[PDB]
Each structure stands twice: as structure tokens, then as C-alpha cells.
Amino acid sequence: GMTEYKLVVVGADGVGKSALTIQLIQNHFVDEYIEDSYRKQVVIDGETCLLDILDTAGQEEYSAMRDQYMRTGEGFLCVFAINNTKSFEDIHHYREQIKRVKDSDDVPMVLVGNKSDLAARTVESRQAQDLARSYGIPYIETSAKTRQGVEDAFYTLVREIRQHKL
Numbered sequence: 001g002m003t004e005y006k007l008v009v010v011g012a013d014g015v016g017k018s019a020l021t022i023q024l025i026q027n028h029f030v031d032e033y034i035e036d037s038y039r040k041q042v043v044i045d046g047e048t049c050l051l052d053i054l055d056t057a058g059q060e061e062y063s064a065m066r067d068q069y070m071r072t073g074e075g076f077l078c079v080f081a082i083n084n085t086k087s088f089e090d091i092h093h094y095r096e097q098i099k100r101v102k103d104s105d106d107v108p109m110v111l112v113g114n115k116s117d118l119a120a121r122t123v124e125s126r127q128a129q130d131l132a133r134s135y136g137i138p139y140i141e142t143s144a145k146t147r148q149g150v151e152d153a154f155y156t157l158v159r160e161i162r163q164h165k166l
């Protein structure tokens with residue numbers, strides 16, 4: 001058949017989880033936006049695959065069932081917004097929960113600084129890049145509005161999942 005990658009997009013409210021997902025999957029920008037899954041057949045490095053993307057929403061809770069559902073993700077996009085310092089400060093907490101339910105410090109993960117089209121940046125690229133380095137994961141800046149970096153962000157995550165097999 002065709003290889004499938006289960007991706008989970010996580011991060012603080014309003015950082016653009018839905019806009020990034022809808023931009024990648026449906027190819028347009030939503031100005032106002034529900035937890036749901038989005039799927040698309042794509043080409044990464046010449047190989048065709050199916051992406052199954054969970055756009056997370058709702059309440060923070062740690063029931064057995066919620067843990068088990070997140071545990072089915074194979075890679076995680078940890079998203080903050082480059083104009084929202086609190087969303088960046090929360091990144092450590094999201095990585096902590098991923099490592100906990102996946103029971104591994106070697107989870108395919110990408111740090112995404114979204115809304116890079118905005119002028120009013122509060123998180124310098126270099127501080128997010130250095131944070132990603134301390135985690136050992138790539139850092140990619142995106143704009144769901146312009147589509148800049150969006151494919152690079154999700155596809156790099158797939159590449160991490162692939163390299164994480166071997």
C-alpha cells in the first residue's frame with residue numbers, strides 16, 4: 001500500500017495550529033477558525049505517502065484515554081507564535097508531555113515558530129533555534145498566511161520519522 005505518517009500539531013491557543021494544518025492540507029489561509037484530523041497524499045523526497053494530521057484543540061487533561069490518543073502520533077509539530085512570548089515559554093511543557101506518553105527522549109519532533117509574516121516579533125529566531133538545538137530537533141519558521149516554510153515544517157517532521165526508523 002502507501003506509507004502513512006500520523007502527525008500531531010500541538011501548542012498554545014491561537015498560535016496557528018489550525019491555520020498551518022489547513023494551509024498545508026487544503027492550500028488556503030483561514031482568518032478565523034474544533035479538534036479534527038486532516039489527510040492528504042503528498043510527495044516527500046520523491047516518495048509518495050499519506051499524511052494524517054491531528055489538529056489539537058480543547059481542554060488540557062491527562063486521562064488515560066487522552067494519553068493513549070496522543071500516544072498514536074508518530075511525530076509532533078510543537079508550534080509557538082513568534083509574536084507571543086508566553087507560547088514560546090510553554091514549549092517545554094509540550095515537549096515534556098510528548099516524551100512522557102511516548103516514553104522516549106527520541107521522539108520525532110519539530111519546533112515551529114509561526115506567523116513569521118508579522119513585524120511585531122517578540123521571540124528572536126536565535127533563541128528558538130538555540131532551544132531546538134538543546135532539544136536536538138529542527139526549528140523552522142512558518143507563515144500559515146503566506147505559506148512560507150509550511151511544507152518545509154511538516155515534511156521535515158516526516159523526514160525525522162523516517163530517520164527515526166533506522
Ligand SMILES: CCN(c1nc(OC[C@@]23CCCN2C[C@H](F)C3)nc2c(F)c(-c3ccc(F)c4sc(N)c(C#N)c34)c(C(F)(F)F)cc12)[C@H]1CCN(C(=O)OC)C1
Binds near residue numbers: 057060
Ligand atoms: C488543547 C488543549 N491545551 C493544552 N494546554 C496545555 O497546557 C496549557 C498550559 C496553560 C497553563 C496551564 N498549562 C500548562 C502550561 F503552563 C501551559 N497543555 C496541553 C498539552 F500538554 C497537550 C498534550 C501534548 C502532547 C501530549 F503527548 C499530551 S498527552 C496529554 N494528556 C496531553 C494533554 N492535554 C498532551 C495537549 C494536546 F493533547 F492537545 F496536544 C493540549 C494542551 C490548551 C489549554 C489552554 N491552552 C492555552 O494555550 O491556554 C492559554 C492550550
Ligand SMILES: Nc1nc2c(ncn2[C@@H]2O[C@H](COP(=O)(O)OP(=O)(O)NP(=O)(O)O)[C@@H](O)[C@H]2O)c(=O)[nH]1
Binds near residue numbers: 015142144
Ligand atoms: N498573520 C498571521 N496570522 C496567522 C498565522 N497563523 C495563524 N494566524 C492567525 O492567528 C489566529 C489563530 O490561528 P488558528 O489557526 O486559529 O490558531 P490555533 O492554534 O488553531 N488556535 P486554537 O488553539 O484556539 O484552536 C487566526 O486569526 C489566524 O488567522 C500566520 O502565519 N500569520
Ligand SMILES: [Mg+2]
Binds near residue numbers: 017019033
Ligand atoms: Mg485550532
